[PDB]
Amino acid sequence: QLSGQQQRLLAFFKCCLLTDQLPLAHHLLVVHHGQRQKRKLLTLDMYNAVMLGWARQGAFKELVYVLFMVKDAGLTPDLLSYAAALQCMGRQDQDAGTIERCLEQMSQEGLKLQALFTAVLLSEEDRATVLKAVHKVKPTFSLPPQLPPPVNTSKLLRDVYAKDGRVSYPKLHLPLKTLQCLFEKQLHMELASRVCVVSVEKPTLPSKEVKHARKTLKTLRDQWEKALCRALRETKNRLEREVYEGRFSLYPFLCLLDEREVVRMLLQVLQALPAQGESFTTLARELSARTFSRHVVQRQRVSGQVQALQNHYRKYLCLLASDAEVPEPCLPRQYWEALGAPEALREQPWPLPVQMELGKLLAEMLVQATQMPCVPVLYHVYSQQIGILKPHPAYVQLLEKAAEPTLTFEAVDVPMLCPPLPWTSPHSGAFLLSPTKLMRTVEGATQHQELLETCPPTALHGALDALTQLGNCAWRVNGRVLDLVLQLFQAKGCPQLGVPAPPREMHSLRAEALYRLSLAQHLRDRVFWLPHNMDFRGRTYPCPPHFNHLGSDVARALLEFAQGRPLGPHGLDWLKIHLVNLTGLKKREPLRKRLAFAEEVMDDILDSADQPLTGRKWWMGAEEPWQTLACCMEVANAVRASDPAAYVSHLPVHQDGSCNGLQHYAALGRDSVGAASVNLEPSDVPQDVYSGVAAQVEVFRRQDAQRGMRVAQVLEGFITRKVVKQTVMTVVYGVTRYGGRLQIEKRLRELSDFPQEFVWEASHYLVRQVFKSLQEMFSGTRAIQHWLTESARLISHMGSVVEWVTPLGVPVIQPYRLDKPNTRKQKNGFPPNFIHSLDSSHMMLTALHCYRKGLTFVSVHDCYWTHAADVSVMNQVCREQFVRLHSEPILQDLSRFLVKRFCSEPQKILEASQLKETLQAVPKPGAFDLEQVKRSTYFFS
Ligand SMILES: [Cl-]
Ligand SMILES: [Cl-]
Ligand SMILES: [Cl-]
Ligand SMILES: [Cl-]
Ligand SMILES: [Cl-]
Secondary structure (H helix, E strand, O other): OOOHHHHHHHHHHHHHHHHOOHHHHHHHHHHHHHOHHHHOOOOHHHHHHHHHHHHHHOOHHHHHHHHHHHHHOOOOOOHHHHHHHHHHHHHHOOOHHHHHHHHHHHHHHOOOOHHHHHHOOOOHHHHHHHHHHHHHHOOOOOOOOOOOOOOOOOOOOHHHHOOOOOOOOOOOOOOHHHHHHHHHHHHHHHHHOEEEEEOOOOOOOOOOOHHHHHHHHHHHHHHHHHHHHHHHHHHHHHHHHHHHOOOOOOOHHHHOOOHHHHHHHHHHHHHHOOOOOEEHHHHHHHHHHHHHHHHHHHHHHHHOHHHHHHHHHHHHHHHOOOOOOOOOOOOHHHHHHHHHOOOOHHHOOOOHHHHHHHHHHHHHHHHHHOEOOOOEOEEEEEOOOOEEEEEOHHHHHHHHHHOOOEEEEEHHHOOEOOOOEEEEEOOEEEOOOOOOOOEOOOOOHHHHHHHHHOOOHHHHHHHHHHHHHHHOOEEEEOHHHHHHHHHHHOOOOEHHHOEOOOOOOHHHHHHHHHHHHHHHHHHOOOOEEOOEEEOOOOOEEEOOOOOOOOOOHHHHHOEEEOOOEEOOOOHHHHHHHHHHHHHOOOOOOOHHHHHHHHHHOHHHHHHHHHOOOOOOOHHHHOOOHHHHHHHHHHHHHHHOOOOHHHOEEOOEEEEOOOOHHHHHHHHHOOOHHHHHHOOOOOOOOOOOHHHHHHHHHHHHHHHHHHOOOHHHHHOOOOOOHHHHHHHHHHHHHOOOOOHHHHHHHHHHHOOOOOOOOOHHHHHHHHHHHHHHHHHHHOHHHHHHHHHHHHHHHHHHHOOOOOEEEOOOOOEEEOOOEOOOEOHHHHHHHHHHHHHHHHHHHHHHHHHHHHHHOOOOOEEEOOEEEEEHHHHHHHHHHHHHHHHHHHHOOHHHHHHHHHHHHHOOOOOOHHHHHHHHHHHOOOOOOOOOOHHHHHHOOOOOO
């Protein structure tokens, strides 16, 4: 636990070792040790940082001065202090006697020699020098040989890591030589830190105004570049004066990059700033992200680290290549580590106070230096009371009238051109050179990231491998879908088909479509990979924000698997059932009645594929239309093949539990009524929980309408399956967060006959009723929701944020605090977040087990995706893993954890006892046999 002022002082010294500003660091170390009140601020890690630096230069006397400085403050030399001293003796080649005397002092204390190379983290150049100094005492080096990495032995993950040769790992469709090329293309992209893309917006020929807007733009950009460069120079000298005065300053941090590359970066931030604006705090974080990211790239580029990674990656590709064969079947993370992974030393990101202080300076420097005639380009506006930076409205229109034919993106904001780097730790994986965190959430990030590093070694393997697997799925653009989206986009849009039209929030959706479509057009003839991330509760997301499989129906329709799989005997039926599912028609029908409807409607399926805009347009009336069209097209190709069973299908087919969370509540509470309602119990027809819930909402609605309640009165006939499903989602998963509830407002807006004046009032009323309904009808939901809410309320009232561990060993922490825990958010969020972690656990177990069976598996929100050829195998694994997850004592273990973590409080002894009382009163499960799930057709459909 280090102060904010102490964190920055150490980061200052750490930074000086990179910038070759060791006298600057030493001066600050001397000054602070000179002031009796400031000596207390000096940690042993600080003196060592200054000692390490001197050792690297070979400045013995300056290092020896720091040793004497350690003693004078009342401190003891650790292993690190002895590593610097030895590195300094190693570099300058010292006499046997002088080295032996230092070695005699070491064992006398006593510190172990063999423990120095193993425990202490030191660079390759550092270790070899420290080794050569010990070698002057002529050993007998006898350094322990490579210890084999341990495997995860947990009940749930045991079979994933077990060396029992019952494995058939999937290779990529591409050969080693092809995959090696793609890695270079990606490395080239990452080294430039920016990707340039042709704009898909129809370029009008340079008119008298377009030429003039572009001319005015060039002069401003030329003006700003010189203006910023001077502002940076002036602040660097000002902050340098502060260091010479013995005070911390962000000076060394501004010396990591070339002045011209900081200015370029600030200019491209100005350029990428949305017309609607961005929050100042987010911009500060974005500038520090871009400064660090580029710094780490430059460091690796000069350290010779790129070539080492080039060699490592090319050896790694053998496991993924179609033409190559690995000695023994292996997992990507396991193979990457086994080769001899050079742990990316430059890991160390700057602490949050350094990250924010730097970001603020860069943001306020960009604001002050940039001006334009009609004066400054950016303005500070305060909104939900959060500080935002909005650009000049004339400048935004100046960019519009310019119509720049080129779009530029940060390399890290676009898909990867080669398979991603496997996740080996919370701080390593995904992008080739750029740093990516395993957990994405900003609120309380330091607290969670620490928890993930505090982990037992093998504990995160399940989550690490699943995320590696998600990232390893090769994608490609559905060209026919893209071509049609571009015809509509390039011609005033089509809002009916979710294609944004040109110009309130018109610009945000249109530009988001413009960036996405321009990337899809750029990648149209390429294979690409989406490395994946996790939020605090374990929800998976692709790292690149602009182009992903995520978003809308149109975004989902633009993608298909790069590698295809022959349909086999059942693929075609699965394609047809999938098409029917996407229509939103046939939800209450069994699988065979859905398959029958596809045959009945086959002419419309073909007419949709053959002339989507000019025929009968049957696809347009689908719940998910673009995905229905993409499916009509695939069905058409398969039926027209030489043999439909041998047709190589690329279209992903989806399966979900309807409301995955209610399935967890039913299994956690072994609730037979709940279990039947969400397809845990086998049945010949799917069960609709929303039907039961809608009826329950109706009886309550009738009463409030029988009374004075206008909201209830106005909702008569508007308690639809779609409205209720969205409310069920909101109640099950919403933290508040108006997310799910704004989607409820959307579904009411889609109901033309509903008074659009009541939309906001009704969404709150529907949430209230659905919550009351779910408790009334299901025991599992009722008791578990109430127990989790109460436990969280008590944990928070004692002054702690709720934290747990998933059944897969992933630590979870709710970050909601007040600008001190946010009691309301901690208690309301615990049931949804706990449920999110169980969805994560289940998906991770399904992914990991499917991989062993050689399947391509992806998770897109509530849904599991595979090739039509492998649906039944995915479903089988899905059911098996749910039964396995829930067969573990989830609630009892969570209770056990929470008691051990939150009930040892000697300042709040009564509250701790009262909390232990609630925690140990774990809801008692019902009679439901969990084994039934393996026989349930509608469990996932
Ligand atoms: Cl290219
Ligand atoms: Cl490139
Ligand atoms: Cl470059
Ligand atoms: Cl293929
Ligand atoms: Cl049947």
